Design a protein around this nucleic acid. Structure first.
Ligand SMILES: Nc1nc2c(ncn2[C@@H]2O[C@H](COP(=O)(O)CP(=O)(O)OP(=O)(O)O)[C@@H](O)[C@H]2O)c(=O)[nH]1
Ligand SMILES: [Mg+2]
Ligand SMILES: [Mg+2]
Ligand SMILES: [Zn+2]
Ligand SMILES: [Zn+2]
Ligand SMILES: [Zn+2]
Lengths: 559, 159, 266, 196, 84, 133, 65, 114, 141, 43, 102
RNA sequence: AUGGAGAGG
């Protein structure tokens, strides 16, 4: 396992990675210093000898140049320390170990390498500064952020071995993935948050700004589209210039809820050939969903055009967002005066309700639900009552947050954050929990030495009444800490166990492939499936279409 | 439980039934019980389904189970994968675990099995039994440093 | 005079609060940028150190030296060392200055920028003298010495641009504001109950007319008036930061013009 | 990293001019994304900012001690008597263009800490180089000018892709390819190849 | 022994692994200045050539597809459909 | 070509649907009793109170890139107050004697309902919707 | 360490302000906010440069060598 | 360690012309100038003034990567009007406003006290 | 003078601790809607009183401002990272010969502090500067 | 440093969970993540 | 030929449900030269959609289950990671046996 | 080469 199934290897590199609004999807920013260290053996041929000679000339510093040379006999001429580094006359059939250059194909990697999309061939772009750069939208298959993560890079040595990367491993041709028969890359974070911003019915753009956005898309035909608004002023709707990014013959229809084709709420989505007709663009469209823009554009126009599509959308939305701006204060976690008073009295009517049930169960008038201990029912009820209290006060708060509320808008776009986030920050953090139950009695018959014994009250067993905004108290803090720790402990432990399951899985299905009779087998030729997946298809090329023979009145089926 | 079923008139409808949920398992005997539909009874214990209703019913159950782990988590993996997993545990005849007790006995290449779990004891009684290695396993060619019969290495090129 | 229009409100050695009427947004902006990063200045940019038995590290000192504001009034008649034909530095392109400090007293001996001593030939040019707005005449506290401590070093001040390092930055702060009633709706005010009661009133609201609810949105209007305040470090008087700013911007617009003629040749 | 689990690295540096700016000429030393805020519920960071700004203006020391009666309301009233908008917002102007920002930005002081983890301390690339004696494979470690390890988890990823020749290359021409002689009979590396 | 050219059961289309290995092998041949059977047009890149050299079916390599039992079908790159 | 449709409508409903630059408008024709109109209006440009009455036309002229408003000498083809250019996406059949058309002016929406209209409306691309007051 | 030659944010020169600050404090009993205002440190970007600063040099000189 | 020198923002390099003019292939009578060693300071000023010339159909600039001090200006003019002249009149126009701005500021300064 | 005792975990088991001194009566005996919700002195039988609740924390968490307004694991993360923050680790750094030493050019006492920072000497030997910082999407970098 | 002098080690049924009794003796928050989480403690 | 008819079954249901005469002519309003194309595409698209021989399809399946299993973290049954670990181990003695009775 | 400790995603 240490020296055979896996071996330390030459032509490799590692560094801190960072994001780049301006690299193209399939690119990889390579620091110059690394480009100058990694080599490719390139053979001297009539087509390259001019550039190749120049490279040797430029020596091994700085890019772009070359380290060494390989003669007929197979000796190793070194550009660093050689009395002939200046005048070497390249023979056809010689090897020139040159630097890694722009548009070289390199295997890019982040560990742990769980699925195939963790090793994707990128196109090299040598850049300044010491970090590998990638496009945010390649973030996800890598599970990579920029809080310190490092990534590896391997450089192919032979002509075929590069073929193998660019034809099999290239980032565009991984966009739609056999894993979940969907796209595994989408529009994230800023771009995502802003693309919704950009496409509200209130979002209009005047001429100056439109022409930049227009010029920002490389594939722009250079035809100013007619402004949605003309008299008496040309305002161009957000939806309009974003459409410039989307190709032709790209049809898309999405009815999301109250969508009724007037979209009184700009719901759903409708893109009649490369122009969007109605609806705010957010996660369900331009995310890595199933019946969304990326899935369509890949299948319809190809990976290349789709990979190109990532850049274009980011280039516009980012520009538009850069001059619109977006932020988040603590003002975004303040709920109304009224809403606060309601939230409090809400929390109380559940504290008063647990009180009763407790008082009741103490008088022996509580009846155990079939198949459970008397105490079990009591816990179950109180936990439900307090959970309900939270969700109720959360929703209470969420309704009072305006549309200009920043936390809401990220949740709206689908950028980051959810109901509970809003809930706990502004209304009530809720009930703490270890091993599935509320906070135990560590000391005898009580939970902390500041309580009297036998205290099953909500505060005493770990109900944080307060919100993060308002501030946890001593006991609250301590309990919240108790729960929090469990998280860490089994996060730590989930990473351990998962990493084993995987290794085992993989080693067990390792030699299973589809042979040239569509028959899935193994090293022994044992049939596992007679037709791969019972239908012979590859999972990338597969989408969720409704079989509409299945439903409806026999009557309407006839009609 | 709520249940979708065909109307007399064709459309599907919500016609909610009563369902009994159990702590514990004796499938052998609760299905023979009078009063219940013995055609739809179920355990989360695919290990019993395999025993009572047969290997193929088990395969279908083992998948149903694996599936439910993913989907409960929100997720959604395509059916061909989990199927391959299931089917692989299943083709031996019964439930073959994904451990050294399961798949790592199955008379495949000696070098292949030695690359997982029992590393030397495999290599040893492979020497005693004087085994022969096809060398068509992936991991054997990894060791030998030859191009493995995988994808681009699944065929031959000539003139 | 004719186009763009200036109106000083307050003036001082250090500040010029003014109003820049009748200009593009673009221009009034491009001017502030230039004022920040592109009017040249002299500042220490090399330190050869002879002795430093001080508590601080060599380069740590060297650093502070760079930050000390040197007179850059006659800077336009000093040269870029990169330009000048001498090898390394000279008297046309660089002021050299000396720093000697030794702790004599029992008490802590301080080292100020007054202790800087010009040495190269200024030849009349008004240049290189450390700016001192300090009240007791020792601007900037370079370093502190204990008893036996010595510090002996030599600094070659060069002409530089703030783009290259923020030491050569003539501007400190450049206040900047337009449309103080959002009459152009260039922001959308975040609020809780009331935009008006919650966001405080800009001082530049006594200068414009509040909108009327009886009026609808003026959509044709553009950004016209601009309320700036340039504050200067002192290596160049205030008035000059703005002027030389306008000068430099104009100067670089020009080299673009000239560059178009350079290409026309056959 | 700020004082609350919000860690992160630099991606770019902008000079004052390109930075967004307050109407009093204030400019940030630092810009963090609003997306680090709502899922990690680090409200403290947000409050420290608010307190810190008041501390700076008022010239007092912001008490951010835990269990006390300090309150986002009380702080906000204080910051209001200081003329700024009470929840930390400030109209900012784009630096590229001079235009206002549509949004107002949460802007203030916030104790940030530089961590021992620097780029120039991690960077490493290796083409060919040292080779351990025993195994004749690349030595381990940056500090030793070694090769990164093509793990099994990587080996599988290549297998998935179907990249056969690459997988061979990674495990032969990089790392430890080697040539032996066998016997047409036994099959062991027993031969005494008197080469030449 | 071998298999009849008629009764060839496998896909008449070219697998993506066939294509990558074909382009790879030719680009390796081109790489070492073996002769090139196209117009070039200014394509100096050994992979870009084999791609154009394949687009015109002017690649004289043959595929030996292996069946699990040791059988095998031969297909010319000349005749394999390339729709991908 | 020429005109496509022209009527005079009376506004019954104006709706700031959580917006401050756009209203969903509801109008009926003061001539045909089988004719209503739903329209998304930039109220920050051309404000529209309830009970107003707006002259409405659909014309397709006055595609090459939009030169700025060099109408200095050209033919503005309007003298109206408010003018958008949209797309027709759906044509809906309500009744053997009724027809509805669906317009998108940069995602501002328009639904028109009437019967003889069918003898005029094309399936895009053009259609400059002009309003007066 | 020692006062800052200049404020990081704006660029203003705060290095000549240190002693004058310490005097305004102790000599005439002012409070740090007032003291900081008399030094004409208005904007809080450069105001915290002085208030938040710690003079570790006073400790460093303590060592004989 | 991998950082470019800071002069590289305003100093031109080994044979880098200041302007580079290319015929836009998309739309007719359009051109795309590359400005090495310049930024939003220039570009935004040229593009905003080109927007006042009523024979300019299209005008927009862009910094394709902040790492590099450079930007592209794209200009389309009406038939017969060569775009370079549209740039030339544009620059000059600015220079005249700037001059007027300078003198107007000076006279204002010469009236003050303190 | 018996005003203050020492309790270990075991004897802790047998006592009733008040969290706030005033929690004694005191005697009690309209509100601010913005303060956090505090239960009451419902146990009128104490034996001891907590010195101050903030003392539940160790040396690292004692550095975090408002930690009682944070999701608990973030507080833990800080507690790991604070040990990797650069600053003045000792005043005698010029006379020590450590293999690796990092000192901040201009360390700064944080604008928002903690009473427990006082005994921790953090104000005197800080590690961190008070950056002027904007939360905003800007260039998307 | 201050930290490292007030550290706790605990070798090898729920030893990692921040236990009630820890109130006032061990810090709730301060502990390594991953392997030694809840085993290494600080006073 | 029976495997082939089988493999294709479910797809053709979709095919016949959509390419059925009443619908082609009344819902879509297709023609000939255009309807022949719709047939043509579908043929091609389909042939593309087939899995390519030599695809390592196991490693793909193991990874496709493994990876999202690493995203599983939190009332009756054992779920998530522990449940998975029960399943692959063929747990003789599972933690939440149960019958569901209809 | 052993062995060990702390830390990174
Ligand atoms: N296989 C392992 N991966 C690890 C381990 N520790 C960290 N990681 C990886 O780090 C990735 C993200 O974890 P982080 O280090 O950012 C900690 P955490 O999950 O709390 O971060 P957030 O996603 O912000 O919640 C995770 O997907 C793994 O790939 C480990 O011990 N084993
Ligand atoms: Mg993570
Ligand atoms: Mg990370
Ligand atoms: Zn000189
Ligand atoms: Zn032999
Ligand atoms: Zn400042």
């Amino acid at each position: 396992r240490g020296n055979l199934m896996g071996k330390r290897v030459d032509f490799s590199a590692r560094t801190v990675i960072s994001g780049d609004p301006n690299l193209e999807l399939d690119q990889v920013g390579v620091p110059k210093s690394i480009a100058k260290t990694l080599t490719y053996p390139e053979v001297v041929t009539p087509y390259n000898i001019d550039r190749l000679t120049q490279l040797v000339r430029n020596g091994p510093n700085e890019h772009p140049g070359a380290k060494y040379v390989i003669r007929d006999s197979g000796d190793r001429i070194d550009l660093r320390y050689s009395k002939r580094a200046g005048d070497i006359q390249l023979q056809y059939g010689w090897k020139v170990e040159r630097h890694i250059m722009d548009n070289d194909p390199v295997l890019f990697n982040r560990q742990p390498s769980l699925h195939k999309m963790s090793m994707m061939a990128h196109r090299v772009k040598v850049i300044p500064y010491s970090t590998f750069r990638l496009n945010l939208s390649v973030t996800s298959p890598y599970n990579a952020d920029f809080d310190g993560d490092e990534m590896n890079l391997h450089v192919p040595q032979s002509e075929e071995t590069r073929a193998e990367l660019s034809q099999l491993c290239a980032v565009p041709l991984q966009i739609v993935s056999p894993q979940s028969n969907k796209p595994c890359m989408g529009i994230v974070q800023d771009t995502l948050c802003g693309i919704r911003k950009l496409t509200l019915r209130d979002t209009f753009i005047e001429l100056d700004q439109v022409l930049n956005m227009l010029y920002w898309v490389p594939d722009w035909d250079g035809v100013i589209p007619t402004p949605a608004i003309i008299k008496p002023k040309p305002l161009w709707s957000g939806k309009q210039i974003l459409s410039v990014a989307i190709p032709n013959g790209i049809h898309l229809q999405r009815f999301d809820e109250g969508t009724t084709l007037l979209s009184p709420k700009d719901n759903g989505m409708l893109i009649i050939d490369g122009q969007i007709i109605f609806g705010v663009v957010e996660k369900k469209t331009v995310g890595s969903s199933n019946g969304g823009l990326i899935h369509v554009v890949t299948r319809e126009k190809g990976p290349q055009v789709c990979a190109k599509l990532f850049g274009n959308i980011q280039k516009v939305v980012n520009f538009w967002l850069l001059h619109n701006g977006f932020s988040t204060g603590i003002g975004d976690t303040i709920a109304d005066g009224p809403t606060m008073r309601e939230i409090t009295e809400t929390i109380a009517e559940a504290k008063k309700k647990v009180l009763d049930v407790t008082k009741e169960a103490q008088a022996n008038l509580l009846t155990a639900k079939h198949g459970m201990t008397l105490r079990e029912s009591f816990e179950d009820n109180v936990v439900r009552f307090l959970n309900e209290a939270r969700d109720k006060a959360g929703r209470l708060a969420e309704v009072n947050l305006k549309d200009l509320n920043n936390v809401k808008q990220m949740v709206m776009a689908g950028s980051k954050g959810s109901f509970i986030n809003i809930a706990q920050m502004s209304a009530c953090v809720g009930q703490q929990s270890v091993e599935g139950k509320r906070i135990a009695f560590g000391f005898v018959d009580r939970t902390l030495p500041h309580f009297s014994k036998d205290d099953y009250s909500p505060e005493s067993k770990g109900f944080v009444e307060n919100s993060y905004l308002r501030g946890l108290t001593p006991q609250e803090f301590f309990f919240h800490a108790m729960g929090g720790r469990e998280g860490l402990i089994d996060t730590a432990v989930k990473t351990a166990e998962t990493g084993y399951i995987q290794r085992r899985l993989v080693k067990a299905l390792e030699d299973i492939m589809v042979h040239y009779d569509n028959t899935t087998r193994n090293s022994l030729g044992n049939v596992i499936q007679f037709i791969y997946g019972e239908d012979g298809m590859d999972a990338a090329h597969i989408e969720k279409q409704s079989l509409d023979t299945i439903g409806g009145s026999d009557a309407a089926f006839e009609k | 439980y709520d249940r979708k079923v065909p109307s007399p008139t064709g459309e599907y409808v919500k016609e909610p039934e009563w369902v009994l949920e159990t702590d514990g398992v004796n499938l052998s005997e609760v299905m023979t019980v009078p009063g219940i539909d013995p055609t739809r009874i179920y355990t989360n214990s695919f290990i019993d389904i395999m025993e009572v209703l047969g290997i193929e019913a088990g395969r279908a159950a083992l998948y149903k189970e694996v599936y439910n782990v993913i989907a409960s988590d929100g997720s959604y993996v395509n059916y061909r994968h989990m199927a391959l997993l299931v089917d692989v545990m299943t083709t031996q005849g019964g439930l073959t675990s994904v451990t050294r007790h399961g798949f790592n006995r199955s008379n495949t290449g000696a070098l292949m099995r030695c690359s997982f779990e029992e590393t030397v004891e495999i290599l040893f009684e492979a020497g005693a039994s004087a085994e022969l290695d096809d060398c068509r396993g992936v991991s054997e060619n990894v060791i030998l440093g030859q191009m493995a019969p995988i994808g681009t290495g699944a065929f031959d090129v000539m003139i | 005079e004719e186009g763009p229009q200036v109106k000083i409100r307050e003036a001082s050695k250090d500040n010029v609060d003014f109003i820049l009427s009748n200009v593009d947004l673009a221009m009034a902006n491009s001017l502030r940028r230039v004022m920040i990063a592109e009017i040249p200045t002299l500042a220490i940019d090399s330190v050869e150190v002879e002795t430093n038995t001080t508590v601080l590290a060599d380069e740590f000192i060297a650093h502070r030296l760079g930050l000390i504001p040197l007179q850059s009034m006659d800077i336009e008649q000093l040269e870029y060392s990169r330009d000048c034909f001498c090898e390394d530095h000279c008297d046309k392109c660089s002021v050299v200055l000396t720093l000697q400090a030794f702790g004599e007293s029992e008490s802590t001996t301080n080292v100020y920028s007054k202790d800087l001593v010009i040495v190269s030939n200024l030849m009349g040019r008004n240049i290189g003298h450390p700016i001192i707005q300090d009240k007791e005449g020792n601007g900037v506290l370079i370093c502190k010495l204990r008893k036996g401590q010595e510090l002996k070093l030599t600094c070659v001040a060069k002409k530089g641009i703030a783009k290259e390092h923020a030491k050569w930055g003539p501007a400190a702060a450049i206040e900047f504001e337009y449309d103080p009633w959002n009459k152009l709706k260039h922001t959308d005010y975040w609020y809780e109950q009331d935009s008006a009661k919650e966001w405080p009133q800009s001082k530049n609201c006594e200068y414009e007319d509040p909108p009327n609810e009886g009026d609808p949105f003026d959509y044709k209007a553009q950004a016209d008036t601009f309320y700036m305040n340039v504050e200067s470090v002192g290596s160049i008087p205030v008035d000059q930061v703005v002027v030389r700013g306008i000068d430099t911007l104009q100067k670089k617009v020009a080299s673009i013009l000239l560059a178009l003629t350079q290409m026309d040749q056959d | 990293a700020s004082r609350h689990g919000q860690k992160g690295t630099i991606g770019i540096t902008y000079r004052r001019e390109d930075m967004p700016f307050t109407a009093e000429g204030i400019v940030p030393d630092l810009i963090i994304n609003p997306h680090a805020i709502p899922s990690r519920m680090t409200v403290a960071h947000l409050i420290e900012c608010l307190l810190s700004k008041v501390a700076a203006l008022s010239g007092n020391e912001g008490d951010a001690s835990p269990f006390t009666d300090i309150t986002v309301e009380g702080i906000s009233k204080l910051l209001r008597e200081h003329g700024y908008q009470s929840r930390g917002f400030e109209v900012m102007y784009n630096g590229h263009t001079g235009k206002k920002l549509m949004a107002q930005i949460f802007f203030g002081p916030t104790y940030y800490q530089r961590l021992r983890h620097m780029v120039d301390d991690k960077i490493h690339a290796r083409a060919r180089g040292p080779m351990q004696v025993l195994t004749r494979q690349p030595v381990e470690g940056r500090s030793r000018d070694g090769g990164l390890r093509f793990g099994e988890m990587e080996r599988d990823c290549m297998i998935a892709h179907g990249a056969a020749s690459f997988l061979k290359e990674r495990l032969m021409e990089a790392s430890d390819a080697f040539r032996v002689h066998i016997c047409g009979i036994c099959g062991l590396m027993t031969v005494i190849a008197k080469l030449n | 022994k071998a298999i009849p050219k008629d009764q060839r059961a496998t896909t008449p289309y070219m697998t993506k692994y066939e294509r990558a290995r074909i382009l790879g092998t030719r680009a390796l041949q081109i790489s070492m200045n073996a002769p090139v059977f196209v117009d070039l047009e200014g394509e100096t890149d050994p992979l870009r050539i084999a791609m154009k050299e394949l687009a015109e079916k002017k690649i004289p390599l043959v595929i030996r597809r292996y069946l699990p039992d040791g059988s095998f079908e031969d297909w010319s790159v000349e005749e394999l459909i390339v729709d991908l | 070509s020429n005109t496509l449709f022209d009527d005079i409508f009376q506004v019954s409903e104006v709706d700031p649907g959580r917006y401050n630059k756009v209203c969903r408008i509801e109008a009926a024709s003061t001539t045909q009793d089988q004719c209503k109109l739903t329209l998304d209006i930039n109220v920050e440009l051309f404000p529209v109170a309830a009970q107003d009455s707006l002259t409405v036309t659909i014309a397709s002229s006055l595609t090459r890139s939009w030169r700025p408003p060099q109408a200095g000498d050209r033919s503005l083809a309007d003298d109206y107050d408010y003018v958008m250019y949209g797309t027709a996406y759906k044509f809906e059949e309500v009744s053997k004697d009724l027809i509805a058309v669906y317009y998108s002016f940069g995602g501002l929406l328009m639904r028109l309902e009437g019967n003889y209209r069918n003898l005029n409306n094309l399936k895009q691309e053009n259609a400059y919707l002009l309003i007066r007051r | 360490m020692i006062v800052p030659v200049r404020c990081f944010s704006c660029g203003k020169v705060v290095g000549d302000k240190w002693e004058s600050y310490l005097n305004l404090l102790q000599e005439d009993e002012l409070d740090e906010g007032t003291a900081l205002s008399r030094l004409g440190l208005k904007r809080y970007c450069c105001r915290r440069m002085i208030l938040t600063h710690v003079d570790l040099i006073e400790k460093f000189l303590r060592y004989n060598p | 360690m991998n950082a470019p020198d800071r002069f590289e923002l305003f100093l031109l390099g080994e044979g880098e012309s200041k302007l580079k003019i290319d015929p836009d292939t998309k739309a007719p009578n359009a051109v795309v100038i590359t400005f090495e060693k310049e930024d939003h300071t220039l570009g935004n000023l040229i593009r905003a003034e080109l927007l006042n010339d009523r024979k300019v159909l299209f005008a927009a600039y862009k910094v394709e990567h902040p790492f590099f001090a450079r930007f592209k200006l794209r200009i389309q003019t009406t038939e017969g009007y060569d775009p370079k002249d549209a740039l030339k009149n544009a620059c000059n126009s600015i220079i005249n406003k700037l001059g007027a701005l300078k003198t107007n500021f000076e006279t204002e300064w010469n009236l003050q006290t303190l | 003078e018996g005003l203050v005792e020492y309790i270990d975990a075991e004897e802790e088991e047998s006592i009733l601790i008040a969290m706030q001194p005033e929690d004694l009566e005191p005697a009690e005996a309209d509100v601010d809607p913005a303060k956090r919700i505090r239960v009451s002195h419902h146990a009128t039988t104490f034996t001891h009183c907590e010195i101050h609740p903030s003392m539940i924390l160790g040396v690292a968490a004692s550095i975090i401002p408002f930690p009682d307004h944070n999701q608990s694991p973030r507080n833990t993360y800080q507690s790991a990272m604070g040990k990797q923050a650069m600053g003045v680790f000792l005043t005698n750094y010029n006379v020590r010969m450590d293999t690796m030493a990092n000192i901040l050019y201009y360390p700064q006492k944080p604008l928002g502090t903690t009473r427990a920072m006082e005994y921790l000497k953090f104000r005197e030997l800080p590690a961190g500067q008070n950056a002027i910082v904007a939360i905003a999407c800007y260039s998307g970098y | 440093t201050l930290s490292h002098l007030r550290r706790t080690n605990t070798p090898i049924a729920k030893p990692r969970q921040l236990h009630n009794t820890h109130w006032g003796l061990v810090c709730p928050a301060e502990t390594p993540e991953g392997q030694a989480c809840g085993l290494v403690k600080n006073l | 030929q029976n495997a082939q008819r089988d493999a294709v079954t479910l797809f053709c249901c979709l095919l016949r449900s959509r390419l059925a005469t009443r619908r082609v002519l009344q819902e879509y309003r297709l023609t000939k030269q255009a309807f022949d194309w719709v047939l043509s595409n579908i043929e091609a698209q389909f042939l593309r959609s087939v899995v390519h021989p030599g695809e390592m399809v196991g490693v793909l399946a193991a990874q496709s289950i493994g990876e999202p299993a690493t995203q599983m973290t939190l009332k009756k049954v054992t779920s998530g990671v522990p449940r998975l670990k029960e399943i692959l181990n063929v747990a003789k003695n599972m933690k939440t046996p149960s019958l569901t009775v209809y």
